[PDB]
Each structure stands twice: as C-alpha cells, then as structure tokens.
Ligand binder design. Sequence first.
Ligand SMILES: *[C@@H]1O[C@H](CO[C@@H]2O[C@@H](C)[C@@H](O)[C@@H](O)[C@@H]2O)[C@@H](O)[C@H](O)[C@H]1NC(C)=O
Ligand SMILES: *[C@@H]1O[C@H](CO[C@@H]2O[C@@H](C)[C@@H](O)[C@@H](O)[C@@H]2O)[C@@H](O)[C@H](O)[C@H]1NC(C)=O
Ligand SMILES: *[C@@H]1O[C@H](CO)[C@@H](O)[C@H](O)[C@H]1NC(C)=O
Ligand SMILES: *[C@@H]1O[C@H](CO)[C@@H](O)[C@H](O)[C@H]1NC(C)=O
Ligand SMILES: [C-]#N
Ligand SMILES: [C-]#N
Lengths: 162, 162
Amino acid sequence: LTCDQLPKAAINPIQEFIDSNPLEFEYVLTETFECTTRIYVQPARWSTTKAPTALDIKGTQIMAYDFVGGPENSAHLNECHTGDKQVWYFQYTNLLTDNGSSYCAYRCNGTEIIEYKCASNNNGTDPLQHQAMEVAKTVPNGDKIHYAKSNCPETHGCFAFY
Amino acid sequence: LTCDQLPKAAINPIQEFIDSNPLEFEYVLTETFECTTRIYVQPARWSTTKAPTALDIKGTQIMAYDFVGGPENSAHLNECHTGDKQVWYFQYTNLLTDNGSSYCAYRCNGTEIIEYKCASNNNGTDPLQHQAMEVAKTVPNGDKIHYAKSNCPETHGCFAFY
Ligand SMILES: *[C@@H]1O[C@H](CO[C@@H]2O[C@@H](C)[C@@H](O)[C@@H](O)[C@@H]2O)[C@@H](O)[C@H](O)[C@H]1NC(C)=O
Ligand SMILES: *[C@@H]1O[C@H](CO[C@@H]2O[C@@H](C)[C@@H](O)[C@@H](O)[C@@H]2O)[C@@H](O)[C@H](O)[C@H]1NC(C)=O
Ligand SMILES: *[C@@H]1O[C@H](CO)[C@@H](O)[C@H](O)[C@H]1NC(C)=O
Ligand SMILES: *[C@@H]1O[C@H](CO)[C@@H](O)[C@H](O)[C@H]1NC(C)=O
Ligand SMILES: [C-]#N
Ligand SMILES: [C-]#N
C-alpha cells in the first residue's frame, strides 16, 4: 500500500465539522500536531473566497488554514500566515454519531505519507480510528505515525486548551 | 459615569455567539486585543464544567478562556493557560441581524474601566457600536479606548487570520 492508494473518503458538509468542535488529535505523523486541538470556523461575512477555516491550537500557538474542495475528495488548504498550499484527503469520517465524531486525514507526497491527523471528540474510542491508523502505518513513512497525547502539559481549569 | 454604572446587558444564548463566528475587534482598551479575532466554541464532549470557550487569536498567538454565567449578566472567565479569573459584562449585544453581529463588553475594577472589547463581523458598521464606544470613553480610564485595526499585518490569502 502506498499513500496514493489510501481511500479518499467523501468530505462531510462543513457544518458537521463545526458541530463537532472542539476536536483533539489522537494520532499524528510529525511532532507538529501533538497535544493539539482542532476548531472549524465558518467563513467570515467579509471573506471573498467564502472558504471556511481549520484552526490548529497547541497551547498558546495557533496555525490557521482557509480551505476549499478540490478534485476527488481533496481539501486545498491555504496556511493563513504564509500563503503556502497543502492538499489533504480523508481516509474516513464518522461525524456526529451517538459516540461523537472522528476522522483520519492525510497528506501525501506521491507514494510517501508526509503528515497524518486522526482527530476525535471521544478520546479515540471509535473503532474505525484505531483501524485506519493501523492501515496508514503500512504505507511508506507511515512508521512515523504515533499517539499524539503521551506528554501534554497540565490543564489550568479548561478541557480542550492549556 | 463610572464603570460600575455601565449597562449590564443580557448575554445571548451561546449558540448565537458561535453562529456569529468569526468576529474581529473594532475598539479595545489595552494593546492586547488589537488586530485580534474572536472565536466562540461549544464545550468539549469531555468537559466536566461544560463551559463554552472564547478564543482570542492575534496572528499565531492565542489565548483561550472557558466561561460561565454569573450574577447580574456577568461572564466569569478562566484563562486556560494560567487559571486566572476575570469578570466581564456586556454594554449591549446586537447579534444575528441582517447586517451581521456586534457587541461591546468591558471589565471593571470598581469605578475604573480596565479592558474594553467591541467586536463585530460587519466591520464596525452597527450604529450601536460607535455609540457604545463614545459612552465607554466617558468612564474613568476610558480615555485609553481606541481603534483596534489601525496597523494590522497584511494577509496571505485568508480573511480573519494572518
Ligand atoms: C483517554 O484515553 C487514555 C488511554 O487510552 C489509550 O488509547 C490509545 C489511543 C493508546 O494511546 C493508549 O495510550 C491507551 O490505550 C486514558 O489514559 C485517559 O485517561 C482517557 N481519558 C478519558 C477522559 O477517559
Ligand atoms: C472597514 O472600515 C475601514 C474604515 O472605517 C473606519 O470606521 C471607524 C471604526 C474608524 O476607525 C475609522 O478609521 C473609519 O471611519 C476601511 O478603511 C476599510 O476599508 C473597511 N473594510 C471593508 C472591508 O469595507
Ligand atoms: C513531492 O516531494 C517533495 C515535497 O517537498 C518536493 O520535492 C516536490 O516538489 C513534491 N512534488 C510536487 C509535484 O510538488
Ligand atoms: C481592583 O484593583 C486592583 C486590580 O488589579 C487590585 O488591587 C484589586 O485586587 C481589585 N479588587 C478586588 C476586589 O480584587
Ligand atoms: C481540512 N479539513
Ligand atoms: C465572554 N463572552
């Protein structure tokens, strides 16, 4: 299995992601998205793209990406502080169930997987998430994939922020 | 007029704030909330307070506050990185109109105003907002109140983030 042969699942309507807020990452590839919370935001009333935005929040640091749909269930991200573009797909989504929401998304460079984001609001308890992670580990560079929450700072009275 | 005599308006249901996302600050007191975007978030499925959260985002920095209602239309904030508490009120809200949403909120220390946050998603065009700002300037230390967007960094293809 190479990264380009991973499933490219249908991307749910943006409101379903917004209604899943807040999410935490369960499995990631680089260290970047360890101990990170994800927030989806509707487009600004003044946005001329009318692209919604994904926010990745790690303590007091944040990265934001406006994004639009592309071909074959792709998401095309624009990192808001640099203008750099990324192309993302979903392995699966399972949003707004009785046990909350989960998904796994990935970014490829050809046959190699370069980033991986398994997110949930149910502490990783959707069987689909462990299962999708075991599959993504099998593609080239998927050996980097690991648990995102082994060493997170202690809270000071909030739950998705620190 | 002293800060303690400012109106303490009724706080809209949290979903109305969430449906106003994203907001930008129009007038502020300290420099802290210049060029800042505000995002409201529903409580985490795993939160035991079930407090929603306000996020203030200024470039790649973020401060988060879980908050609950208190007496007399107060909001009681818990800053998520420190645990420090703040008590906030609203001068007015005017959310989810045909011209979008606005509000002005403030924090007092007795008769003195110590922070001020006028927010909107309509570029400050609600007549109530200019009007409320002119009133808050009249309370002690309200002379610090100023336009929040005179010198913000340039965008890189997003609209509420930079
Ligand atoms: C959340 O889950 C933690 C342990 O469950 C882990 O599940 C997978 C993802 C592995 O990374 C492995 O570490 C564990 O089997 C708990 O330690 C933690 O207390 C749980 N939190 C709540 C709120 O239940
Ligand atoms: C947004 O508004 C800007 C100027 O309007 C300002 O209104 C008050 C709040 C004062 O601070 C004063 O600077 C101005 O009267 C415009 O420069 C800007 O282009 C406007 N943006 C859009 C998208 O219309
Ligand atoms: C895939 O490989 C690396 C990723 O940084 C780079 O050399 C190359 O530009 C990428 N491919 C394309 C078509 O951009
Ligand atoms: C109001 O004034 C300052 C704010 O930092 C401080 O000395 C004092 O603790 C504040 N009042 C109360 C009751 O905390
Ligand atoms: C991108 N979801
Ligand atoms: C606090 N709104």
